[PDB]
Amino acid sequence: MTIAIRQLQTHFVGQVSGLDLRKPLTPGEAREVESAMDKYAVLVFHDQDITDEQQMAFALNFGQREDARGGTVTKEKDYRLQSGLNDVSNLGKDGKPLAKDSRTHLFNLGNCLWHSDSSFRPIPAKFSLLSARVVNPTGGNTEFADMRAAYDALDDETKAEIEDLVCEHSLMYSRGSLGFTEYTDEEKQMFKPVLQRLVRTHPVHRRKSLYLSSHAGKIASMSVPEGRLLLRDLNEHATQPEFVYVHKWKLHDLVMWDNRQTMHRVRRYDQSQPRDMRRATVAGTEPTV
Amino acid sequence: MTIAIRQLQTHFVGQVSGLDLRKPLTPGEAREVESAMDKYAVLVFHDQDITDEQQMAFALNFGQREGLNDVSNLLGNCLWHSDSSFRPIPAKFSLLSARVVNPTGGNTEFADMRAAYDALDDETKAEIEDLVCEHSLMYSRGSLGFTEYTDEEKQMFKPVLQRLVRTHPVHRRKSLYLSSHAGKIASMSVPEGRLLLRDLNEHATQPEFVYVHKWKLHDLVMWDNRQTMHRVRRYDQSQPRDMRRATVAGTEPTV
Amino acid sequence: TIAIRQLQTHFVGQVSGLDLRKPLTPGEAREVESAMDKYAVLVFHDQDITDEQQMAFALNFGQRETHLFNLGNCLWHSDSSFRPIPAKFSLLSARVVNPTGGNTEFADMRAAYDALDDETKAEIEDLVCEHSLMYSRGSLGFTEYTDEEKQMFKPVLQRLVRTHPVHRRKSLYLSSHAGKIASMSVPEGRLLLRDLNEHATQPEFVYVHKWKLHDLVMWDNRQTMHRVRRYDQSQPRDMRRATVAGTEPTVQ
Amino acid sequence: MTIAIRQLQTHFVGQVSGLDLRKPLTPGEAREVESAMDKYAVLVFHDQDITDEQQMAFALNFGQREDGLNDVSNLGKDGKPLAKDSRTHLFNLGNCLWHSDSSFRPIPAKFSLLSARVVNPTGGNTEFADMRAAYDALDDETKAEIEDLVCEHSLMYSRGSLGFTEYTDEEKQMFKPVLQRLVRTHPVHRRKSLYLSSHAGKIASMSVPEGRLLLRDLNEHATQPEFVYVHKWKLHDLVMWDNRQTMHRVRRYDQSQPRDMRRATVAGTEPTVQQ
Amino acid sequence: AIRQLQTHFVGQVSGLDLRKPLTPGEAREVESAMDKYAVLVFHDQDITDEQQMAFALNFGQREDSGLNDVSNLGKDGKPLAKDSRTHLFNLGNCLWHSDSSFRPIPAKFSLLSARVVNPTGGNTEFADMRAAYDALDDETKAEIEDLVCEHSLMYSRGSLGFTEYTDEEKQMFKPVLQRLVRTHPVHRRKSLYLSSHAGKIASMSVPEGRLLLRDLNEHATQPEFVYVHKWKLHDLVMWDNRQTMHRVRRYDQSQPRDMRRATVAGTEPTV
Amino acid sequence: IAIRQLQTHFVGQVSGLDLRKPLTPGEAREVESAMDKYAVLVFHDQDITDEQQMAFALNFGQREDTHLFNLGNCLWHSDSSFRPIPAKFSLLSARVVNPTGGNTEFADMRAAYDALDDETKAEIEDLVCEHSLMYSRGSLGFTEYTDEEKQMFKPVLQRLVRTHPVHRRKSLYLSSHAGKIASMSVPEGRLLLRDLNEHATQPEFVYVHKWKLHDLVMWDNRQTMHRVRRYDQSQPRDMRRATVAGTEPTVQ
Amino acid sequence: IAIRQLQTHFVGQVSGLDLRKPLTPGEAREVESAMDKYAVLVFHDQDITDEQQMAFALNFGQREDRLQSGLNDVSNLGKDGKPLAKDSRTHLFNLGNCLWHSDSSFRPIPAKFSLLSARVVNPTGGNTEFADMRAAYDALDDETKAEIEDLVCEHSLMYSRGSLGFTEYTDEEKQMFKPVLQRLVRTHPVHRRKSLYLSSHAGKIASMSVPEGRLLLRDLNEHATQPEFVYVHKWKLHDLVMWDNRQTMHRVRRYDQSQPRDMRRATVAGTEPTVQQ
Ligand SMILES: O=C(O)CNC(=O)C(=O)O
Ligand SMILES: O=C(O)CNC(=O)C(=O)O
Ligand SMILES: O=C(O)CNC(=O)C(=O)O
Ligand SMILES: O=C(O)CNC(=O)C(=O)O
Ligand SMILES: O=C(O)CNC(=O)C(=O)O
Ligand SMILES: O=C(O)CNC(=O)C(=O)O
Ligand SMILES: O=C(O)CNC(=O)C(=O)O
Ligand SMILES: [K+]
Ligand SMILES: [K+]
Ligand SMILES: [K+]
Ligand SMILES: [K+]
Ligand SMILES: [K+]
Ligand SMILES: [K+]
Ligand SMILES: [Mn+2]
Ligand SMILES: [Mn+2]
Ligand SMILES: [Mn+2]
Ligand SMILES: [Mn+2]
Ligand SMILES: [Mn+2]
Ligand SMILES: [Mn+2]
Ligand SMILES: [Mn+2]
């Protein structure tokens, strides 16, 4: 009836055991994992030595593939992986680490900022599923923040202030804060800003949460300076240690998160060493606006 | 009339009593205040009903002018910064007087850059020792959405160099020279540099290095820009907030 | 699974086996309230809760009832004793704890009463006190009040000796808000109250609470006094209060 | 969104919009709902898809649990409809009489809150009667006559009406009659109202037959259509009532069909009479 | 001459001296009027007990002078004590009922004469059980058609607090069966056979059966089915127990109320 | 002169003196040194006159220049602290002893000072209190003063920490007459005085004197506080005072 | 403490005490004096635990040498908490309480106070009656008083049980139930009133033949249990009745054994013997 789950942080995060992700799930098991995703927001599976196909098959229990187009500087040519998965590694087509100053790596440094995946899309992602294929031993922890806990801890005046606010999300905002400011020219059209609610409501349990993300570069109804200051304050509030779970990677871990309830980021790592990390993304169902 | 100092935070900040800033300082008083600034980096004076000229006269004990700077609301200041870090010779002391206090928000927060430096692991210390940052108003304003400037403006705000690790002239303690004005590290790519600056700013502004100052009427707070960062928290723009700053010019560069 | 450890000779229970993030069962609500009747003060460690969760916990026990408030809390008092229907339970949740000072102290007014001699007990049995914010603020140095403030803070009557509605133990109804005994001259009455307060807050009747992050302390204003000890106002402190309205008066 | 109230009947009953009962209330919202209960005596909320915990949590704004929802459904422990000759169902049928909740308790109930979880489509309307308006409409002579009268309330009396008249000694003590004023006064707005209830089987200072006949006349008077609001249930309705100002009853329903209704009861905060 | 006093029933009768014996045709007209109007009001009838009964006996036999004492007076022509055994049984008449419905063959006509009028209350109310039956919806009529009620004095007195009965009293007051819906033998109109004496429906549990009866009583005693009669001295009111219910309202027990009833026995059972 | 110590920190009982007789210079010298050391001196069986009591007092300096006074004495105080030059010694002679209550208690302000932590010593060092009869009578409930009285009872300044002119020991200058600290806000200063008073009058710093007929007790106001405990006011209590005027101010 | 006398000669109803709480020195002294005067005390609505009941009893002395406490189980229930079999060993022995007796009169130092608490009331029968042995003594004539003054009875459980049929005892039982001596006429240590020491356990007068002694005890018991000397207690839930075994007899009237009767007794050990032995 229930799968084995141990909670890893005071507010959220469950560790799951007893499931082999190389193999199909039963209807009951898929139902259990999704309820755990609703409750815990982040799930940690150890020792899941899976193929790209096995990983995506697992993800497809929970919806459909998110269309990857408009998500990277993909050159419209080709890259490393053959399957459905998003390549979130530090490797080129080469199979070995990207150059310190390449346009691909510099864009990938965006992942070091606190973000919710595909928040730059009119329908943002539901679940993201990350598999560790080669572990970089010098840094690159992945950190998760509970946006519902963060929301709850705000005072009434803040909650009343932010309730109806709308943010503009774009890859140009997140990469822009890192100094990556030149886009040509269908990129400016491909990364055209989308609207998202600052405060969102989960469809299952109806918990309210802060929809924070590096992609959010302004609040619609405010001046750019004031809006950004507010977002900075909310981001500082929401990423305090009491709302954060730090994941230390082991080989063949799978960590999956609900983008609708969380932010995440990768910490600085040594770029000269391989880091083979591969993501499956489940498309969102409904927009926030 | 005996100067008494009580330490307000684990690592820094001193509360000073027995001085009347309306009255000129004696040689011993000037020496003690500057010595406390060396030690505590931030000093808090309560109950100082002082004019603009008294504030400056107090300030001028410690050097020259960079009368007062208007930091009243009558927004870059909300970012963690060190004053005039975008100048080739950056500011020494800043002295802030509260003439009208905003009752809703507007705390001034102070971060100890020396304690922050010390808490770093020896590898990080070694990584950063010789690193140099570019500081400009264009960078700090840029964070708040001001990213385009004319050729006349580009020269007035032309970036200057400062070392990431500075050393205090008096006690020789090392400290992180962080500021919102710092937009890149000279020997690193813009994104890699800004990420390191982010990590250092995050580390250096944890609660264990931070003193939060809650304002009272006629409060004077003074700080060493060479040893600290500071920021003002969001305040109700509708209500008058009258804060007046005296600034002591720097007496040496960092590079 | 509720377990209570007694913390002081006369009173105070440390409660384990409850997660206050979750709604109480009717049985748990009954157990908690009976423990409040018995111990008068309950300490709950490790309760990392929200304002809403705190209030929800409180509302099992009844209904809902800055600088001047904080300062007055440094004097021995019982909450809202200046109201004709005074407070039942108060609840304090430690969100940010000041490391220097700010212990909260509690005194068992039932034990204080019991320790009085037979003649003192007979002397004070029918006495009535006048309670007002003007008296407690007076002690802090604010003696002058405008004509509309005088109505705003019009003194209320309270029995000096009250009886608990559940176990019917008598206790001394002492409070910084009490500034007069009705049947006595002003100075004699205040001297009697001063001696009663000194008696009632001897270390044998006092529990000292040294705060830990996420503590929740709930106390019965009908059986106790409390005070906060001196602390450095320049340090961060974040203590969140909930108060349950009184369900009965002491006089008319 | 803030609270709006719409009048549903000449003298009483309000329909409330703008409140989500899945969410904890602010102090202001608790105040507004209570004042509205004082004025309207019965409040109707539509579209409140709530859990038991959420229902109780809403209820606890207004006091304490009466000595954990009360199961006023027609269902057994297995979740299926009770048999029509089962002792549980025969007691539940007591709600079909005009009553005020816990009037057999020395300190009787304040608020009752009833949530429709599964609606029976064949009957089972809940009717409410305004005991204040009913009192006011009496002539001066009747008001003077009844002013100081006291009733005896017990489960033995309401269940007696329905055929259960023989009680063991344990039961006679467990259901020992309590005293209640016949004319009560609301603690907030001071309006007088008839404290009528099926649990009332006697007036203290009168013969049992003369008392019951007087009670029958007051009940007939107080439950004329002019003082009565008829509630037709929709799924996830919540109707809450002040037992201190009203009577209520459930109309006959089809016992073969499920009727899942769940009550939260706030304990009384003051007696009507000493004992 | 008959003047109709209410929407569905009740006739006021003029030009008849109840002191004088009735002709064959007058006995027929009065009875046909009772068939139609269910209740008849006679004004100014200063009649003796023997004269009252003589009028009654035109319509059948006495139910086992021969008049029923429905007064508030004791054996000495004086108002009864408020707490006395007889008065507390008289109070049974304050409940809506049909006369002798607890007898296996229930009463036909009842004839009440006003000898001394209590001026403080004590109106007699009548309810038309035919109009009441008619106003019910089709689904209800279907439900109630074949139902059978248990009638006993133990039930009506039970309501007023007399629940404890001896083995000997339990035989004297043994419940009788009566149809819930009865058909008048003359005009064939269906009517609700409601009564305070009815305490059970045969095929149902006591509580559910009693709840059904309450709903029926509530429906049937709405003001639209009820005629209120205010008493004048030497009034006589007669009713068909087979088509009606009646009750007396609260009266001042300190003041005399001398009312005398003549009961014609039933000529048919309902079961 | 033989001296017996009566409390852990202070108080000496003196035998070998007959106060009906003039003191020799040596006797006067030994008594004053004993006053410096013990702060309070107890002399049993001195059946003396007013004139003899004053003559005895006058060895130690000069004379200092109602119901309310007796009531004020129930509060912890140092005599004449509301005067710009406050009392040196006070002397109390027991002519008629009330059997019910009326113990006189003494608190050692030097021992009280010593036992404070370094932070508090640093905090208080240069603080200055305002002392006035309006403050002490305030605590008894008399808060309203005409401008005539406000001049008569004009507050005077005293050091919170004073130093004894002979042995140089620091001590807490506490008194019921002190109602404000000059450099602090009114409530915060009063709260600080309250904490210091509570600290200084703990049992470890207190000598309780139980009166015996013809006792004389002399105390140094510069080193102590004192108070009288409650007694039955309808019984006679004849306690005669002599006061030696101060010989040095604390500030200005 | 308020006391209302409930019978001509004795019995007091007590108001003002909550027996869930410790007594003060004054409260304990008042209760004991009330016991000296009224011999039987009735308390209503005392919803107490075993520990609380015993704590109340311990005010007046020490304990006498299903429940798991100091209390004597005088219920009709077995270990399982259900009514005993009507033919069982324990029940037939408990029926002993239906005879007029004074508690522990078969011990060399007999009981002081007994305190009985009603936890589950039997609805059919089970009244507890009490007889005033002092009033009974007073009403005897001068000659009878003179005759009995120095008589001594033998008390044993073998005698009380013998009268209900159990006449056969082994050597072991005969030693466990070895008869003890008690004065027939006893004196109260406080007010010095003489009273008849009657009991179902008394089966012999020492100086007389068994038949003549038993006939004399019968005459005294008949005299002493006349309605004028007897108070009848009808039980209510959480009643507590306390009696002085030194001045009274008591008995329980027959009760419906198929229904639970949960009655719990605390017994205070005697503080003085009646004979030196
Ligand atoms: O590589 C990492 O640890 C960070 N991952 C992501 O941001 C991602 O896959 O969405
Ligand atoms: O106004 C404030 O509190 C912030 N002040 C400054 O940043 C400043 O004057 O340099
Ligand atoms: O500890 C505190 O903050 C003071 N406590 C109180 O008096 C209170 O909150 O009611
Ligand atoms: O079931 C119904 O409609 C009526 N319910 C009640 O009487 C109740 O819950 O108190
Ligand atoms: O006395 C009355 O008016 C009531 N009449 C009857 O019920 C009757 O006599 O049948
Ligand atoms: O009377 C007493 O016990 C003490 N009196 C004094 O305070 C005094 O005379 O100075
Ligand atoms: O059970 C009873 O009523 C009487 N009981 C006793 O004899 C007893 O407990 O001593
Ligand atoms: K600046
Ligand atoms: K308060
Ligand atoms: K009920
Ligand atoms: K009849
Ligand atoms: K003085
Ligand atoms: K025995
Ligand atoms: Mn990501
Ligand atoms: Mn600045
Ligand atoms: Mn408080
Ligand atoms: Mn109900
Ligand atoms: Mn009739
Ligand atoms: Mn003095
Ligand atoms: Mn016994």
mmCIF file with all atom_site columns, C-alpha atoms in Angstrom, chain C residues 70-138:
data_model
loop_
_atom_site.group_PDB
_atom_site.id
_atom_site.type_symbol
_atom_site.label_atom_id
_atom_site.label_alt_id
_atom_site.label_comp_id
_atom_site.label_asym_id
_atom_site.label_entity_id
_atom_site.label_seq_id
_atom_site.pdbx_PDB_ins_code
_atom_site.Cartn_x
_atom_site.Cartn_y
_atom_site.Cartn_z
_atom_site.occupancy
_atom_site.B_iso_or_equiv
_atom_site.pdbx_formal_charge
_atom_site.auth_seq_id
_atom_site.auth_comp_id
_atom_site.auth_asym_id
_atom_site.auth_atom_id
_atom_site.pdbx_PDB_model_num
ATOM 1  C CA . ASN C 1 70  ? 7.663   45.053 26.076 1.00 0.00 ? 70  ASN C CA 1
ATOM 2  C CA . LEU C 1 71  ? 8.736   47.214 29.030 1.00 0.00 ? 71  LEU C CA 1
ATOM 3  C CA . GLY C 1 72  ? 5.653   46.331 31.120 1.00 0.00 ? 72  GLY C CA 1
ATOM 4  C CA . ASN C 1 73  ? 6.472   42.643 30.543 1.00 0.00 ? 73  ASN C CA 1
ATOM 5  C CA . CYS C 1 74  ? 9.590   43.095 32.718 1.00 0.00 ? 74  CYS C CA 1
ATOM 6  C CA . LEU C 1 75  ? 7.269   43.498 35.749 1.00 0.00 ? 75  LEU C CA 1
ATOM 7  C CA . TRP C 1 76  ? 5.557   40.515 37.404 1.00 0.00 ? 76  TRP C CA 1
ATOM 8  C CA . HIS C 1 77  ? 2.046   40.346 35.938 1.00 0.00 ? 77  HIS C CA 1
ATOM 9  C CA . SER C 1 78  ? -0.911  38.206 34.837 1.00 0.00 ? 78  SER C CA 1
ATOM 10 C CA . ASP C 1 79  ? -2.085  38.980 31.289 1.00 0.00 ? 79  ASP C CA 1
ATOM 11 C CA . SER C 1 80  ? -5.029  41.338 30.793 1.00 0.00 ? 80  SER C CA 1
ATOM 12 C CA . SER C 1 81  ? -5.824  41.581 34.527 1.00 0.00 ? 81  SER C CA 1
ATOM 13 C CA . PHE C 1 82  ? -6.969  45.198 33.779 1.00 0.00 ? 82  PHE C CA 1
ATOM 14 C CA . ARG C 1 83  ? -9.846  43.701 31.684 1.00 0.00 ? 83  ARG C CA 1
ATOM 15 C CA . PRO C 1 84  ? -13.120 42.783 33.457 1.00 0.00 ? 84  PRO C CA 1
ATOM 16 C CA . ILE C 1 85  ? -12.843 39.310 31.883 1.00 0.00 ? 85  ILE C CA 1
ATOM 17 C CA . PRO C 1 86  ? -9.088  38.549 32.130 1.00 0.00 ? 86  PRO C CA 1
ATOM 18 C CA . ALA C 1 87  ? -7.016  36.137 29.977 1.00 0.00 ? 87  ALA C CA 1
ATOM 19 C CA . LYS C 1 88  ? -7.132  32.360 30.167 1.00 0.00 ? 88  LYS C CA 1
ATOM 20 C CA . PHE C 1 89  ? -4.037  30.903 28.403 1.00 0.00 ? 89  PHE C CA 1
ATOM 21 C CA . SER C 1 90  ? -1.117  32.727 26.862 1.00 0.00 ? 90  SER C CA 1
ATOM 22 C CA . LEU C 1 91  ? 1.337   31.104 24.442 1.00 0.00 ? 91  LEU C CA 1
ATOM 23 C CA . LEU C 1 92  ? 4.844   32.213 23.508 1.00 0.00 ? 92  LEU C CA 1
ATOM 24 C CA . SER C 1 93  ? 6.834   30.741 20.582 1.00 0.00 ? 93  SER C CA 1
ATOM 25 C CA . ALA C 1 94  ? 10.604  31.401 20.253 1.00 0.00 ? 94  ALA C CA 1
ATOM 26 C CA . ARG C 1 95  ? 11.418  32.157 16.583 1.00 0.00 ? 95  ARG C CA 1
ATOM 27 C CA . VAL C 1 96  ? 14.695  34.043 17.286 1.00 0.00 ? 96  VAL C CA 1
ATOM 28 C CA . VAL C 1 97  ? 16.279  33.769 20.762 1.00 0.00 ? 97  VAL C CA 1
ATOM 29 C CA . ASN C 1 98  ? 18.428  36.551 22.256 1.00 0.00 ? 98  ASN C CA 1
ATOM 30 C CA . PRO C 1 99  ? 21.572  34.853 23.727 1.00 0.00 ? 99  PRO C CA 1
ATOM 31 C CA . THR C 1 100 ? 22.074  37.515 26.449 1.00 0.00 ? 100 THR C CA 1
ATOM 32 C CA . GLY C 1 101 ? 19.231  37.860 28.975 1.00 0.00 ? 101 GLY C CA 1
ATOM 33 C CA . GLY C 1 102 ? 15.488  37.561 28.392 1.00 0.00 ? 102 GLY C CA 1
ATOM 34 C CA . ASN C 1 103 ? 14.661  34.504 30.515 1.00 0.00 ? 103 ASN C CA 1
ATOM 35 C CA . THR C 1 104 ? 10.921  34.237 31.132 1.00 0.00 ? 104 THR C CA 1
ATOM 36 C CA . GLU C 1 105 ? 10.084  33.583 34.767 1.00 0.00 ? 105 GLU C CA 1
ATOM 37 C CA . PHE C 1 106 ? 6.918   32.009 36.190 1.00 0.00 ? 106 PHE C CA 1
ATOM 38 C CA . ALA C 1 107 ? 5.471   32.023 39.700 1.00 0.00 ? 107 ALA C CA 1
ATOM 39 C CA . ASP C 1 108 ? 2.855   29.551 41.023 1.00 0.00 ? 108 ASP C CA 1
ATOM 40 C CA . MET C 1 109 ? 0.200   31.685 42.762 1.00 0.00 ? 109 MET C CA 1
ATOM 41 C CA . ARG C 1 110 ? -1.592  28.612 44.191 1.00 0.00 ? 110 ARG C CA 1
ATOM 42 C CA . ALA C 1 111 ? 1.542   27.402 45.987 1.00 0.00 ? 111 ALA C CA 1
ATOM 43 C CA . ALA C 1 112 ? 2.210   31.005 47.085 1.00 0.00 ? 112 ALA C CA 1
ATOM 44 C CA . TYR C 1 113 ? -1.313  31.160 48.604 1.00 0.00 ? 113 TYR C CA 1
ATOM 45 C CA . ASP C 1 114 ? -0.978  27.751 50.329 1.00 0.00 ? 114 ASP C CA 1
ATOM 46 C CA . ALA C 1 115 ? 2.227   28.866 52.075 1.00 0.00 ? 115 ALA C CA 1
ATOM 47 C CA . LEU C 1 116 ? 0.510   31.841 53.794 1.00 0.00 ? 116 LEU C CA 1
ATOM 48 C CA . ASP C 1 117 ? -0.348  31.422 57.505 1.00 0.00 ? 117 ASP C CA 1
ATOM 49 C CA . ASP C 1 118 ? -3.983  30.850 58.604 1.00 0.00 ? 118 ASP C CA 1
ATOM 50 C CA . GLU C 1 119 ? -4.535  34.463 59.754 1.00 0.00 ? 119 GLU C CA 1
ATOM 51 C CA . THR C 1 120 ? -3.169  36.030 56.551 1.00 0.00 ? 120 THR C CA 1
ATOM 52 C CA . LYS C 1 121 ? -5.444  33.670 54.550 1.00 0.00 ? 121 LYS C CA 1
ATOM 53 C CA . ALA C 1 122 ? -8.426  34.868 56.645 1.00 0.00 ? 122 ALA C CA 1
ATOM 54 C CA . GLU C 1 123 ? -7.368  38.556 56.315 1.00 0.00 ? 123 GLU C CA 1
ATOM 55 C CA . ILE C 1 124 ? -7.151  38.570 52.478 1.00 0.00 ? 124 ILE C CA 1
ATOM 56 C CA . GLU C 1 125 ? -10.129 36.257 51.718 1.00 0.00 ? 125 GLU C CA 1
ATOM 57 C CA . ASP C 1 126 ? -12.602 39.051 50.788 1.00 0.00 ? 126 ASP C CA 1
ATOM 58 C CA . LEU C 1 127 ? -10.202 41.719 49.495 1.00 0.00 ? 127 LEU C CA 1
ATOM 59 C CA . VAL C 1 128 ? -10.662 43.185 46.009 1.00 0.00 ? 128 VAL C CA 1
ATOM 60 C CA . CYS C 1 129 ? -7.998  44.900 43.865 1.00 0.00 ? 129 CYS C CA 1
ATOM 61 C CA . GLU C 1 130 ? -8.301  47.672 41.297 1.00 0.00 ? 130 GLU C CA 1
ATOM 62 C CA . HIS C 1 131 ? -6.403  46.762 38.107 1.00 0.00 ? 131 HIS C CA 1
ATOM 63 C CA . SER C 1 132 ? -5.433  49.259 35.373 1.00 0.00 ? 132 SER C CA 1
ATOM 64 C CA . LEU C 1 133 ? -2.714  49.908 32.777 1.00 0.00 ? 133 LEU C CA 1
ATOM 65 C CA . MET C 1 134 ? -2.345  53.258 34.583 1.00 0.00 ? 134 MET C CA 1
ATOM 66 C CA . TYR C 1 135 ? -0.964  51.457 37.646 1.00 0.00 ? 135 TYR C CA 1
ATOM 67 C CA . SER C 1 136 ? 1.590   49.241 35.852 1.00 0.00 ? 136 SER C CA 1
ATOM 68 C CA . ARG C 1 137 ? 2.641   52.067 33.488 1.00 0.00 ? 137 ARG C CA 1
ATOM 69 C CA . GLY C 1 138 ? 2.770   54.314 36.598 1.00 0.00 ? 138 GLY C CA 1
#
